[PDB]
Amino acid sequence: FLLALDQGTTSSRAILFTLEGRPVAVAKREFRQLYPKPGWVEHDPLEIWETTLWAAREVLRRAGAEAGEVLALGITNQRETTLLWDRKTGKPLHNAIVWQDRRTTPLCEALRAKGLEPLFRERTGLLFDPYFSGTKLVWLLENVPGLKARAEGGGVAFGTVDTWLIWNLTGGKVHATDPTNASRTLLFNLHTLAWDPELLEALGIPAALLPEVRPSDGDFGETLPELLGAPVPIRGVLGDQQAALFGQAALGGGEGKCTYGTGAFLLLNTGKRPVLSEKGLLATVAWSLGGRATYALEGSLFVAGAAVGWLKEVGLIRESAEVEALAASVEDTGDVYFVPAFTGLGAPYWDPYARGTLLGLTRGTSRAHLARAALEGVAFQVRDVVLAMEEEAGVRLKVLKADGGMAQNRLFLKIQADLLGVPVAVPEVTETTALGAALMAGVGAGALSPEDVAGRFREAERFLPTMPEGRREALYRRWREAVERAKGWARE
């Protein structure tokens, strides 16, 4: 028995698979999203833990398994979302600032002015943006009432939704995080596999609330007995996206996959060395086996399903499902393009001033059309990244693996394939982020080795591109022109 805790942005998921990867039971529960000011996204650190546990138990229940059975535990969470809490009380000193926050922009701009941008893109493989937790911390570490002094001695502890779980699972016992969940932090160096002293100072943030660089398969303590009902070993902790890449069995260099949830994240296994992109892609760690690391190229797409989501929050569709009924009723969009950049643009543009844009509306533009446009937008963005990775060092992408909330929409995937002109495959085990977690755990616990994950992976289906080359490219030229008109809307 393997147990994975998948802490997502919109809800808490718990899955108890076996040792070969098959799932036994599932329990999911949403939790209020805090919207302080526009562009601000906050999460109640309590609302989170009361659902990561509520589901850990719910699975065992719906399964009929007792905790004593569980071999190891696997942790997969949101990625950059940052928290700040007191070690003693174990209490949140301020709500959670989600990776979706668009507040630290000015700083990124300042730090960019100081000429530091180059030092960070070649060290952390990232860049200056309100996405990563780096600036997300400085804000809290200089804005909450009088918090910057408290955390000068160590009384305060920082942590990504992963280290936060480790905490709540060991009542203050173990305080740490895996390389990946940290690679997506502006402080972590990806060459030396440990935080860089310079960076920490470069932002003034004290190395006094930082977790420990434990590999994703190592030992992360043992859960509290009264929580689940027995001591469970946790040998797996990994950023959802990096997890989802491991669950898709993308262990080969050149193997990539894309997950479609609130947003969309495309990662490509780059092997031993990190591909320091300059076109707008991020270099990051996929996972760390007892020490060594395998890197990847990533394309972050802030908005994906939220595209349809927004369509719902305005009544263009009644419930979220008709999305593929309307879009399906029309062959095209009538030359309409919807650029879903609500909170700015991700990859490979990285434009904080871009906003949601609709284009080419005519007296005859309809709901079916808008529905299809929302779906295309997401796919077009993925192509932007796929094309970016194609020349940012490497070969042609032969296949693209998919999983996540949107993958359930068959139509969407066919559209993805057509606009990419490349086959798109889905696995037999849909809860991939979870499986990625569980497996990593069983791997750290000596149960299964990585080679046990590849020959155990199974493809359920795949959608083939039926759209001719001429058509695909005309559409792409339209979309790219569409994106040029969404850029820089915010006054700057």
Q: Which residues bind a second copy (CB under 8 A)?
A: 35, 38-39, 306, 310, 313-316, 334-335, 342-343, 355-367, 370, 481, 485-486, 489-490
300 is in an annotated binding site: no
Nearest Cα to Cα of residue 67 among 204, 225, 189, 205 = 225
Tell me if 299 is assigned to a ligand binding site: no
Discontinuities in the chain (C→N > 2.5 Å), after residue: none
Nearer Cβ to a second copy, position 296 or 368? 368
CB of 142 to a second copy, least distance (A): 26
Q: Which is nearer to a second copy, 114 or 363 (CB)?
A: 363
Dig out the tokens for 469 from the structure. Answer: 């080359």
Q: How far is the CB of 345 from a second copy (least distance, A)?
A: 13
Phi/psi of residue 42, nearest 5 degrees: -115, 150
Report helix, strand or coil for 73: strand
Was 131 annotated as part of a binding site? yes
Query: Is 356 annotated among the ligand-binding residues?
Result: no
Which residue's CB is nearer to a second copy, number 198 or number 481?
481
Minimal distance, residue 144 CB to a second copy, in Å: 24
73: left (phi over 0), alpha (psi -120 to 50) or beta: beta
240 a known binding residue?
yes
> Considering the complex, what minimum distance in angstroms separates the CB of residue 483 from a second copy?
12
- Residue 333, marked binder: no
Residue number with CB closer to a second copy (67 or 336): 336
Enumerate the β-bridge partners of residue 402: 258
150 or 472: whose CB is closer to a second copy? 472
Ligand-binding annotation for 7, yes or no, is no
Q: Are 220 and 46 in contact (CB under 8 A)?
A: no
- Kind and range of the H or E run holding 367: helix 367-391
Q: Is 52 annotated as a binding residue?
A: no
Whichever of 228 and 370 has its CB closer to a second copy, that residue is 370
Compute the least distance from the CB of residue 342 to a second copy, in Å: 4
Q: Closest approach of Cβ 376 to a second copy, in Å? A: 16
Q: Which is nearer to a second copy, 327 or 440 (CB)?
A: 327
State yes or no: 89 annotated in a binding site.
no
The H or E element that residue 389 is part of is helix 367-391
Mapped onto helix, strand or coil, the DSSP state of residue 397 is coil
Task: State which residue, 315 or 455, has the beta carbon closest to a second copy.
Answer: 315
103 belongs to an annotated ligand binding site: no
Q: Residue type for 491, please?
A: R
d(CA 311, CA 323): 9
Peptide bond into 348 cis (omega under 30): yes
Cβ of 109: how many Cβ atoms within 10 Å?
12
> To the nearest whole angstrom, how small is the minimum distance from the Cβ of residue 441 to a second copy?
34
Phi, psi dihedrals of residue 231, rounded to the nearest 5°: -75, 115
Tell me, what amino acid is at 89? Answer: T
Least Cβ distance, residue 285 to a second copy (angstroms): 29
Which DSSP string do the residues of 125-194 spell out, in sequence order? S--S-TTSHHHHHHHHHHHSTTHHHHTTTTSEEEEEHHHHHHHHHTTTS---B-HHHHHTSTTB-SSSSS
Binding-site residue ranges for ADP: 9, 13, 262, 305, 405, 409
Binding-site residue ranges: 9-11, 13, 79-80, 131, 240-241, 262, 305, 405, 409
